[PDB]
Each structure stands twice: as structure tokens, then as C-alpha cells.
Write a protein that binds this ligand. Structure first.
Ligand SMILES: *Cc1c(COP(=O)(O)O)cnc(C)c1O
Ligand SMILES: *Cc1c(COP(=O)(O)O)cnc(C)c1O
Lengths: 405, 405
């Protein structure tokens, strides 16, 4: 940076702290990643200066010839990546992407069936403190109490009982592959639309390492950040038959002017995801998660569902008599970043929890491999088995520092 | 830029076109401005990498110590600028800021009274194709048919008849000072909340050149872009008594993760607005608008309300037998950027219109003064009086190029 340090010492000093923090810590929060310098440059461009309400070639204002090229690059590359008939790259966030889909197909008070929030469902899939749970009548399907895999007969029974207008599949804390074919089968049986929220797994889908929901879903929503490793924002994919309605839902429905600089960054990120080296990256993400899972089990930890098919895992801390809150706090003391997370059938509140959620997308981006996964697991074992030993925590701190250089 | 040109030639080429376009054209779209290099650098920072759901010191995730400092800088500087008891700097956009306020005080189907959309009200103030008009029962007050000034007796009558839960004041195309005291008086009479949407005028309010709605309104919403000259995003200001509810409305109510890099840029922009030179800038904005208005009238144009008190004006093109669409198109041919805009009591559709809206914020940022206003007015006269003369349009083109260098 050149101008910010002189203009705003306070903001710059804080940004520099954050940059150094990102390097120093081991980031295991499953939603996190590190974007490329090219993506950041796109976000830091003069495109922030342009109002571009509407869509390419159909804008409210003149002068959009070049931002139109940028948005179309984003849409076409997204279609290349996911094989979708239509893309809308304007959603400000994953929340707004979901909001738009709900606005398209649902009326106030309509019934929606989503994944149980305590079993892996997202806040925007019907939390009573979120617009989704307030605006619509959400009902939930659960995972099996033993396997922690989605119970597809429960999905079916809930669908047949409650007759939802919309079924939502996908999750923020589900460590296994989701069967989109089965979701669509159930949707078809009850005459419901199927929406898949692939935010967490979008990068893996792009790399062919998780089945693609696009062929099975009427609507697919996602964040552009997370495993896709793009800028912070949202996106909707859908069948051509919904394109006009989806676009109208985003604008003039729920948003105003789009963030054209972020959309440029989205295009950049999609370009990166189209490359062979991103496919190699995504495979390392999944390989690293399996390795970390195995290594954690070797340390004596129990994992929700007994492992992982994707980028993330959940440690069930009940065998260690620890809460997720306690684990999160002590790992923070040694420079490992996780989040407490409810496990299926958790006896604790979401503010305490019996688990921690861990993902490998961020550490993989930093170049961590299998050996590092082993060491991360060993450090977590050292810490969680010795929460009352400052000597153990100091050793952990030193081993964490050794990993981050 | 260093990395984007190599990583993504296509995106870079389009961005460069846009950068050159921004320099070459005369930007008179009233919502537009040009942000500082410091603001852009903040947006292009590593803060995009951080999930920070929640609020400073009360986040969902660990590791937010430094982004907390950034958000608090934004909130405290906003409070300094506007004298508000509380600020929420997380809204992704002006639309989302409004959405959150509506979510806080209204239930589905509640009555809201806003400014007539054809008289200056915004899309998010009850358009039947916007969430506002779909979710809530919007009624409208109008401007006087002769003076084009808000008819405060009409505001009062509509309020007393319809008994709205909420009254919205503020506009996207109103060239005169809004009387917030009168709005609050009317609100008090009918027991309604008052929300002021100051998006267009926020910079002028910050500089003390338009009366501040904060003392009179329960809620004030704004864009951080526009006259405030910040990054693209939103903000809510409110009384301490609504702080908890407003914060909950933004998250977990309507949004997920905030855009921390944009919030950094918001802090930078607020820092700039706190400086004496921003006050001087804002005075030039208003002076330039008055000068341009006067100069346009000298050219024989009729202005909605007979002039301006702020950054913007509207040309009523009926005396010239032109539509806003025609004017917008021909001005585009010579490098002057305006938008067609409905005038009060417009005989034309919003897709055709009888007016063009013009603002001075962008050209003022570029260093244009009174002499340039005179020339801009003369060029507009030359163009609109000679729409069928290619020679006239070429002369206009050359004079536009002379202004932009
Ligand atoms: C992260 C996530 C979201 C929300 O995205 P934001 O950008 O935080 O609004 C929605 N759904 C799922 C499944 C997610 O993982
Ligand atoms: C520009 C504007 C908005 C919307 O802001 P976006 O960032 O485009 O969503 C809302 N209200 C008013 C009065 C505005 O001027």
C-alpha cells in the first residue's frame, strides 16, 4: 500500500496487525481461506465508482460498457465451472443469494424444509432469529443419531407430512457428501422446488471432488468465498426457466447497485478455479482433511460421522469431557483458530456446544500437506489432553510457530 | 496493479477501459463520485479473508481483535460525523440498510408512508417490484404541482388517513432541503417512527450544508458512497434505545458475514469527511450545483422546483419537446453522462420520462468549479437545442474533451 499509510495511520496499523495475524496463526475455521493478490487488486479497483443497477446490456444508467464485460466474464466463467444454464453474480453475500431465491419462489408464511440447524444447517435455513425463520415456516430433517449421515427417509417423511414449497439441501457443518439425486427425487414426489446451498463445498464441486448439485437443483446458491477461494460475496445458479425471475429477485427485488469491483474479483476467482492447479489444490484440501481426521482419531478423538468426505470435520468432545467453548478458548491461547460448533443431538446450547469444527481449505492454500496435518493433530491432542498445563500450552505455542515459520 | 495484469488479461483490460472512461467522460449522474486511493487500498486489503459475524468484542469467531479495531473506528468516526448515538456500519448497501430498519420496526403488511417514487422517492421506499412494496403496505405523499416542494400538509393528511407505523423521509431525486422537524412533528401526531434515508445528501449533512436528520429521526439510513464519497455500502444511525434491535436486524437478521475490507474503507472515508478540506469540497459541490442550475436556466432550460438547495437538479424537458430518454441518449453521444428521470407529475413512463437528473459531486471531486459549470450548461444547451445536427454534436464532443483534458 502507498496512500493508506499516510492518509489513515489508525486504519493502516490495524490492517497490518490483521495481515500479520493471518500469517502467524493456524487457521482451521472451515469457512476461511486466503485469496490471491489478483483477486484483492480487482476489489481495490476504480470499479467501486460505477453505478450499474440492472444487468449487462440492460442497465439503468449509461456508461456500463466495460463493467458489462466484467460481469459477463463472471457469469460465463461461472457457467463454465458449474455447468449451469444461468448465473447471477450480483448477490452481496451468501445470505443475499439465499434471500433472493426465497423471494423468487416463496410467499410470506410458505413452508420450507431444510437441514436441522444443530445437525449442520445454516442460519439462513430457518433460524427463528434470521429473516428465513421469521418470513417462512421452516421445518427440519435430521441426521441419523449413530452415523450422523442425513437420514433420507426423514427428509422424505418431513416432506410428505409438511408439504413444503421448497426443500433446501446443503450445510455449514456437514462432513459427508450430500446425495442431491435423492433430494430431487423427494422434491419431485411432493412437488417442491429444490434449492442447494453449496457455499461450503463450492470449490470442491468446481474441482469435481464433490457431486455437482446443478443437474439436480432448480436453484443453487453459494458464497464466492470459502472453498471456492474467491472474494466475499454471493452467487445464484439456476435453470434457464428461472433466469428472468432470479435476476428480478436480485434487482429490483432485494438489492440496489451491485458491487462491480467485487464482481471483477469474482471473475478473477472463477478464472483461477478453471485452471488445472486449482483442481490440484482442491484435491489437497480433501486429502488433507482425510489425513487430519485420521490423525485426530489416532490421537484418540471421536469425529462426527466417523470422518470426512470433504474439507471439514467435527470433533465430538464428549469423550474428553470438554465443551466446544473450552476447546476453542484454549486452542486460541496457542495460536490455533477453530470454532465451537454444535454436534448432532448436542446436549449443550449453541453458545457452549460439545464440538469444534475444523476445515483444511486455508492451511492448504498456505501450502500445508499431510505431514503438517499429522503435526496439527498432535498439537491439538497435546493441548486438549493437558488444558491445565501451561508447560504443555507453551510447547504447543512453539510447535504452532514452527509450522507458520 | 501488479498481479492482476498477468493473472487475468481479460479482467484487467476491461478495468483499464473503465478507468480511462471515468477520466474521459463528464460524470453528471447525481449518485456518482470518485473515491480516494486510500479508500480503494482499504477495499483491496487482506481483510476480505476474515469472517467476523457478530459485533466488536461479541463475535462468533476468534481472531477478530484487529478487525474489531477497524469496525470501531468506522462506528466512532460515523458518530463524530453525524452526532448519532449508535452506528451500524455492516450494511452491504443502502438497500440492505433500509431492509434492516424495516425488519426492525415492521411486521409483514404494516403500512409505511414514503415519498412518491415519481416525485423523488427511492425504489426501496415502496416500489411494487421491490421487497419494500411487496412486504409492506406503502402509501405516498407528494410534492406541490407548481413548486415541486414536498407538500407537508399532504404528508400530514396521508399520515392521519393511513396511520402508518413508519414514515420515510428522503429521496434520490429531490433538489431541495427536506424539513426533518416537520416530518418528526407529523410522525409524533400519528404515533409513527420516523426513518430518514439520507443516502444522496449524506456528504452535505456531514459538512453542515444540509440540516442533520439525526436529532429528529429514530433511524437514519444511508449509503457510504454518493456525496459522502466513501466505498460502496450502507450504514444505519439510530438512537441508543434501538441499538440492540438494529444490530440484531443486520445480524443475525438479514445479513451473514460483514465485508470487513469495505468497513475498513468506510472508516477511511469517514476519516476524510471529518477533515476541513471535505467541508470545503462539499461547499463547492453545492455552489457548483447552484451555478449549474443558474447557467442551465440562462440557456433557457426549466428546472424542477426552479433550482436546487443541494448537489442535484432536474431538468424538465417538456418546453423543448424532448423526453429524458432522448436527452440521455444524445448527451451520451458527446461524452456527458446523465440519467433520464421522472419529474413530478410526469406524463411519461419511468422508462421514457420528461426529465434528466444532474448532480455535481463527481465533477467537483475532479476539481471542476464555477467556470466549468457555465461551460457544461452551454454544452448541454448546444446539444439539446441541436439534436439533429452532427456538426453541433461534434463541437460538443470537442468541448467535452477540452474539459476533461
Ligand atoms: C457461509 C454460508 C452462508 C452465508 O454467506 P454470507 O456471505 O456469510 O452471508 C449461507 N449458507 C451457507 C451454507 C454458508 O455456508
Ligand atoms: C442510492 C440509494 C439507495 C440504495 O443504495 P444501494 O447501495 O444502491 O442499495 C437507497 N436509498 C436512497 C435514498 C438512495 O439514494
Amino acid at each position: 500500500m502507498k496512500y493508506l499509510p499516510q492518509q489513515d495511520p489508525q486504519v493502516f496499523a490495524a490492517i497490518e496487525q490483521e495481515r500479520k495475524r493471518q500469517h502467524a496463526k493456524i487457521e482451521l475455521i472451515a469457512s476461511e481461506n486466503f485469496v490471491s493478490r489478483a483477486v484483492m487488486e480487482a476489489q481495490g479497483s476504480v470499479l467501486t465508482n460505477k453505478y450499474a443497477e440492472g444487468y449487462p446490456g440492460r442497465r439503468a444508467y449509461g456508461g456500463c460498457e466495460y463493467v458489462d464485460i466484467v460481469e459477463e466474464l463472471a457469469r460465463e466463467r461461472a457457467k463454465q465451472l458449474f455447468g449451469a444454464e444461468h448465473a447471477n453474480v450480483q448477490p452481496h453475500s451468501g445470505a443475499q443469494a439465499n434471500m433472493a431465491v426465497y423471494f423468487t419462489v416463496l410467499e410470506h408464511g410458505d413452508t420450507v424444509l431444510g437441514m436441522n440447524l444443530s445437525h449442520g444447517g445454516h442460519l439462513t435455513h430457518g433460524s427463528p432469529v434470521n429473516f428465513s425463520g421469521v418470513q417462512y415456516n421452516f421445518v427440519a430433517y435430521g441426521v441419523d443419531p449413530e452415523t450422523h449421515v442425513i437420514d433420507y427417509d426423514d427428509v422424505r417423511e418431513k416432506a410428505r407430512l409438511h408439504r413444503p414449497k421448497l426443500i433446501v439441501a446443503a450445510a455449514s457443518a456437514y462432513p459427508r457428501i450430500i446425495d442431491f439425486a435423492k433430494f430431487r427425487e423427494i422434491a419431485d414426489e411432493v412437488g417442491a422446488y429444490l434449492m442447494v446451498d453449496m457455499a461450503h463445498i463450492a470449490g470442491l464441486v468446481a474441482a469435481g471432488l464433490h457431486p455437482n448439485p446443478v443437474p439436480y437443483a432448480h436453484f443453487v446458491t453459494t458464497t464466492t468465498h470459502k472453498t471456492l477461494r474467491g472474494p466475499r460475496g454471493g452467487m445464484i445458479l439456476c435453470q434457464e426457466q428461472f433466469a428472468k425471475q432470479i435476476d428480478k429477485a436480485i434487482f429490483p427485488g432485494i438489492q440496489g447497485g451491485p458491487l462491480m469491483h467485487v464482481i471483477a474479483a469474482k471473475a478473477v476467482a472463477f478464472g483461477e478455479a478453471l485452471q488445472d492447479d486449482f483442481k490440484a489444490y482442491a484435491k489437497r484440501v480433501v486429502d488433507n482433511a482425510k489425513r487430519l481426521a485420521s490423525a485426530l482419531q489416532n490421537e484418540g478423538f471421536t469425529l462426527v460421522s466417523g470422518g470426512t468426505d470433504n474439507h471439514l470435520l467435527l470433533v465430538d468432545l464428549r469423550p474428553q469431557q470438554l465443551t466446544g467453548k473450552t476447546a476453542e478458548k484454549v486452542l486460541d491461547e496457542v495460536g490455533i483458530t477453530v470454532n465451537k460448533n454444535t454436534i448432532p443431538y448436542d446436549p449443550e446450547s449453541p453458545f457452549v456446544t460439545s464440538g469444534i469444527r475444523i476445515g483444511t481449505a486455508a492451511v492448504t492454500t498456505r501450502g500445508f500437506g499431510l505431514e503438517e496435518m499429522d503435526e496439527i493433530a498432535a498439537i491439538i491432542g497435546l493441548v486438549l489432553k493437558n488444558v491445565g498445563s501451561e508447560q504443555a500450552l507453551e510447547e504447543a505455542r512453539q510447535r504452532v510457530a514452527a509450522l507458520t515459520d
